Amino acid sequence: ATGRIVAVIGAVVDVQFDEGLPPILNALEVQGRETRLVLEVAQHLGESTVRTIAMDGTEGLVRGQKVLDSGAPIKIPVGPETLGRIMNVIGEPIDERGPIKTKQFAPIHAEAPEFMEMSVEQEILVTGIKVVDLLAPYAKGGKIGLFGGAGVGKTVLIMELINNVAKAHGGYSVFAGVGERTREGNDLYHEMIESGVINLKDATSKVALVYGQMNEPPGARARVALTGLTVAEYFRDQEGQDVLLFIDNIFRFTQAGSEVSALLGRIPSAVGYQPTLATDMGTMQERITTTKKGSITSVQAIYVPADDLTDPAPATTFAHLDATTVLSRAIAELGIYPAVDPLDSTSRIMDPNIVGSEHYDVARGVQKILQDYKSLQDIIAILGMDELSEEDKLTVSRARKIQRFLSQPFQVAEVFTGHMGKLVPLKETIKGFQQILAGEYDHLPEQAFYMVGPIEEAVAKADKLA
Amino acid sequence: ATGRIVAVIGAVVDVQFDEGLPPILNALEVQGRETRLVLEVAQHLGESTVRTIAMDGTEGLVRGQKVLDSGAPIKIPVGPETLGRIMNVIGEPIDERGPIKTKQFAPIHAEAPEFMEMSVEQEILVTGIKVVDLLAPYAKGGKIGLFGGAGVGKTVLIMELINNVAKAHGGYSVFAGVGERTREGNDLYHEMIESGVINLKDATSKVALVYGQMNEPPGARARVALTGLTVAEYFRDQEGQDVLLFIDNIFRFTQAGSEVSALLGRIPSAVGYQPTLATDMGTMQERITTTKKGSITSVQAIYVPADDLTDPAPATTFAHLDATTVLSRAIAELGIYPAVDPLDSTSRIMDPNIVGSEHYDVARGVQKILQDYKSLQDIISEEDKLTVSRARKIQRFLSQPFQVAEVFTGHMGKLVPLKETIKGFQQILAGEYDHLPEQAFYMVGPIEEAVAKADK
Amino acid sequence: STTSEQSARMTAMDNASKNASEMIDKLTLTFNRTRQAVITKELIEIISGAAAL
Amino acid sequence: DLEETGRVLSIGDGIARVHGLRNVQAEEMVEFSSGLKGMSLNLEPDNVGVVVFGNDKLIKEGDIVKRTGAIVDVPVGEELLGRVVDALGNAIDGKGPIGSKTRRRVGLKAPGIIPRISVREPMQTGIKAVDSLVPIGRGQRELIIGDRQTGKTSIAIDTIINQKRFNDGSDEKKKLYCIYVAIGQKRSTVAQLVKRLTDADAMKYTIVVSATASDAAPLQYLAPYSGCSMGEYFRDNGKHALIIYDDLSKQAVAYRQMSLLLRRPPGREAYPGDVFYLHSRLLERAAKMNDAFGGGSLTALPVIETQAGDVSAYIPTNVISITDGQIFLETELFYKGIRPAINVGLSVSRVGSAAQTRAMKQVAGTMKLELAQYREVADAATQQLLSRGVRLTELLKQGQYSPMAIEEQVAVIYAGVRGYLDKLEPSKITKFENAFLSHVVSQHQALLGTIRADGKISEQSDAKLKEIVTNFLAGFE
Amino acid sequence: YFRDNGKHALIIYDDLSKQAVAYRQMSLLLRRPPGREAYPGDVFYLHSRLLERAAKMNDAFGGGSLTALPVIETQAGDVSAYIPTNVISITDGQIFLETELFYKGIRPAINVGLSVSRVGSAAQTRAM
Amino acid sequence: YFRDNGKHALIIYDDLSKQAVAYRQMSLLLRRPPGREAYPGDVFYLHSRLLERAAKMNDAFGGGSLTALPVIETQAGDVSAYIPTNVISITDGQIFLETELFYKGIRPAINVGLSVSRVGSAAQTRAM
Amino acid sequence: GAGSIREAGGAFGKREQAEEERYFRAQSREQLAAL
Ligand SMILES: Nc1ncnc2c1ncn2[C@@H]1O[C@H](COP(=O)(O)OP(=O)(O)OP(=O)(O)O)[C@@H](O)[C@H]1O
Ligand SMILES: Nc1ncnc2c1ncn2[C@@H]1O[C@H](COP(=O)(O)OP(=O)(O)O)[C@@H](O)[C@H]1O
Ligand SMILES: [Mg+2]
């Protein structure tokens, strides 16, 4: 079927068909372009006219330009041949290594797994990060979301997780860069080549990369996450593999939809977002899941606009996650890194019957003492430290020591900090925090717990200060 | 070109033409009215219809009433014959003294001076006022935010700036009463008449008044600043003068622009301001500058909504301000006149590369000793009583008698040159007058008058 | 001890006033920010209600 | 002929609805009968919406709009160096037309992942605080964010003036061509800036793009992209360019004006939903290329003005999410005479550390550590930390329009971090600094030349440095 | 069905904020004009015509009942938001949960100061 | 009529908040573009052309006068609301009344710190 | 703004209420034994 362009507004293109109106979500190819310009049908306008979202720039489009219907949605190559390669939103290679020669192509639009396919296994996933493993531990096959404002450490944390989990991972991995820095994608590509996780010479590569970055028009930024989902879903279903899916940044998805929502002719919702924010997010996120056919452990960095966690996009994302690591700018200005907010990060396996009564008690006691410190903060700020009781001063001192000991030097942060990274086992974390809560280190200064690994390094640093 | 009214909604009038559609910003004259009604084109709506904002009330307008195209934007009489007179936004006299018999008329809409007409280095505008010239000097072709309203001698300072720029530089002044209270406009007119700045009998008037009243539609209040700026532009570009232009108030200029934009159906921006807030402010302020012929220095009264300095209207105005003069009541109730707050008044040309090293060091020493005196007063040592004495003498020597007050107080007015101010404060800081009493510096001009008052 | 204590209380209340003024300045900034945001949000609601007719 | 020409149906809100132009492309430049230009934004079934690059006063209903057949582009090349142009590439300095042979589209997409390489070589600003603590590399995007009148334009101008020591030499590799885009500034400020660059002889390698406060909002929106295209010309031909956008806050305000006049849904602070894309597609074009693409680079120093120091606002956080780090300027510091008022605990350079030279590394690692300790403290052990930190923050101060060579900065930071300043009282530090510099410039150009050619400090150069510093400190007031 | 047959039922709506969001989406896409926070004008009617169907019947109608436990998620503890205040004005009492109480060890984090039951002791056993 | 015939009149608008509300209703129903708090663009123009008609005439025009006492009700002392801001900007001063002063026994509850008269002592007698 | 410390329900309003209740329960115990 062939139609003709009748209107071009930004990323939105109206196409009028004389015969054979293409279904919604079909991919159309514009004729007369130097590169492949794909339009995805979004609405049927009536009078044999459809409204489409362009996957590339619409500059140079002329009213009346011919458009062919492919007969199917955007289909990307899926298989083990995509491992070690970089593809864009429409499945084309962008690594200059030639065609991705798979034996099967999958549409980026698919149905979410049914209710009878869901899994319930909730085994922990130790990450080596003290605050994560202690207070909001991740689960294998679960959904992890890293919230944070601009420049608080979402990319640093997700790169630390790639270093600590994906290399030690037995299955495959997919990194979907969505609306982020292109130089960050170049860094990740070359670092994965250096570390052997991507092999340019044989078929031993373990990661597939899908990049649509912040230089892309809103259609590509809205569908590149779906392309990454399709790759991970193939690896989960047809291969039965355990997949790792890193999405940085998923908020861009929502934001991209916002950018087109006005041009699609829809009445705006709260804060100018599309009225379909929650259902679009749900349609996308329900495919990011572990079924009883295969497992997908998902780590999604979630941008928080203007540091407002009540913004509709992060507020809607909160319900789709099994673990949330909420980074805070206030904690990042105290020098504590990672900037995890220990009273805002949660996990669903923080359950005595899952992590053990010892782990549960240490975590809950840490959170109790931090909440008590936060309650005292007002009086401490106005009436000074001296107007408290003895137990209040002891609580403040222990809470500050715990705040310091929650920080940790990362191996991805070695370059701009000099401090060698630390991977702290879960038992050593539980032991160190149990000991701090007990009072076994009430004599050491609080600066001794700042940016160390296990508690033995804390006592060594204490003996090195004095 | 003749058209006819097709719609009247409040202060918005849609006028349809049959030949020769008028460009945007042209003035149209409504026909068959007892008083002059002027519309200003804002948009071309299509089908030979333009939308316009009225400069006066639209009551009694009939659909089909004839409207004449004037052929240019609002044109106002410009010349030395506007000095001492009052005109409204459309240039007609509102003081009942007869027509303004200038030889030329200028359109109130003009583009800012080009790039190659700008001055490439900033110079100082000496006002003869000691605290201003020393601590927060004015730049030629700059904008000055005048803070403080009633009870701090704002009108006395305005009239003294007019008088001093007329004497020292030979440059006239324009005063634009944007959103002016009619009672306070009459008051200002009569204080200018009594203080000799306006003269109703000979041609020695120093200021020209342009009043856009508070009871006029928002278009008149949005264009009165341009009318005053057009008079000042004539005085600069045709007589090579260093003109003064007062805008009271500038927040009301922003408010009128916001109301006009809301009347035209445009979507409000943040806090309810017009979406074109920055470009409206810019198109107005960029015409206030130093060209190769002369300059226009603008003193603009700043009102801050809800005391919020990050509000869009002050935040947009502050991007154009080159200096700040804060009139404080804590200084007036202390006895000092003018009531300029010497620690809150700022300047961008208070820079050793602009005013020189000597001026900068004297001003910085004065400000440091005044801050030290505030600190010491907070706790009320060896030489700190000497700092208290020197700082009190500096506070007294910041005062000055004005000429525009000579009739009411008897004291002669002083126009202190810049060098005499710099050296007087330098000497007081060095200690050359640590024996002269405290009240030998109060209400004097140069430091020689301080020693002559100490003799007595 | 009475003189030592009166001096200490004077300095302590001075410090408390200083800290209270600091918190007042930060909260005044936050308040102006929030009131501007509230006015903008109400305008946007009214404008979107009017644009849907 | 309504295929190459159209008639204006309506004009207003900066948009012209035109009837005709059936063969016009999206984002194509059109020419109005009055001499103005526009961009085809909305191709519709019965009209074309045109964004006018100029005043709507000059366009009437019924005017003829011809189409130029070219997607919006600007003249690029070496012929723009030393010229002041507007957002469309037209010279506004009266020196005649631009003799350019090449044009480049202003909305070209940034390079992909493959054409890029890591930032490796330094972009020297000549400012001790920046070059030591927040180093910038070629191909980086470093944001200059701060309140009004905190010294942001001064940092940009010091960088541009500093590039003269490399643009005069014979090392074609180390040359850097500068572009300064003024967006919503005062016209007199831009004239005085061009005068400052002409005095310092920094105009012969600088392009100035001027869209000032009296220019229409579409021109202030277009200016950063025109400047970026002029810079991409160098980036794509093996040369290195630095671009300053002063500032992106006013470009965002101009774009919000254009968007609200198009009836588009406002969001936070009434900004459109694509105000992040507006800056992201721009600042992504600053890249370092690998050697298979010429090896050139384009460095971007965007400027952002905050309101009362709020860096968690919408536009500041957007640009912080786009760039590779930020240089915070505080009003508290600037008021206390600490200038450049760079906050060291808040500024950062993510990718610039790999670009810092080895000598500057050797001194700046110690300087940064000592400053971190001085910040984390403020007896007889921490008193030394406080003294060293006070001396170092006095050493970090600097004047205006006088950038320093990297070897002189290295010598000064050496004299600061090895401990030869703990004797002096702080109020004299600056004095010593200046005098010391003169000494090393007057009679010790050989050690400076060796440090400059070697890129590091050898034990021989370290010994000579200790000798010179001890001798000068001995006979110094 | 159970309420009308002499049997007793309990229903939990988890949660009604997401139902309000979905109704807002449907209404905005049906081009019905938005109200506060873009919600339709009749979101209160949406929830009140639902929560009025929980009732205790008399003996002539079977004696069955239907208890309703709607759930509402607030943002940053803003009980004063649109949908929270709607549902609070509808129901017969609230059980307020707090994050501070949760992390201070109080689990379930019920705020007994704010949590009210408009029925109260009328629906307790005598020992309790 | 009195101001024009050498006589002196006083007028009390009680109050202008309700007139602004009525005008806002008339304007919103005429589909005029709403502004801040849905008020039309020319509500300041409304109150300003109403209040500028109170004037003291010179002796050549009869010497009469018209004094105006507009009343404005604020919500929780918010003088930065739209209509309070407009009317405070238009008038020559304001008598500000408080609730704390009222219940502290101070009746009339005139806050003298916040009250101001810009005419001042020119409107007094030599004894006062 | 009289009584705004207790009205804000912060860490200072809770301690104010605790102080009032402590003092006046002590005074009530002192006044009941003398009745
Ligand atoms: N390093 C410095 N040393 C001394 N003075 C300085 C320094 N930097 C800036 N200044 C002074 O502070 C003034 C304002 O600095 P500058 O204009 O560069 O900052 P800005 O943030 O761009 O201001 P604006 O908001 O107007 O754009 C300058 O005129 C200059 O005199
Ligand atoms: N774990 C960390 N340790 C030290 N610094 C960090 C850490 N995480 C973030 N930072 C600092 O915050 C900056 C921003 O890092 P990044 O993760 O890229 O921000 P974003 O949240 O936007 O992804 C880093 O350059 C670094 O200076
Ligand atoms: Mg990131």
Ligand SMILES: [Mg+2]
């Ligand atoms: Mg600047």
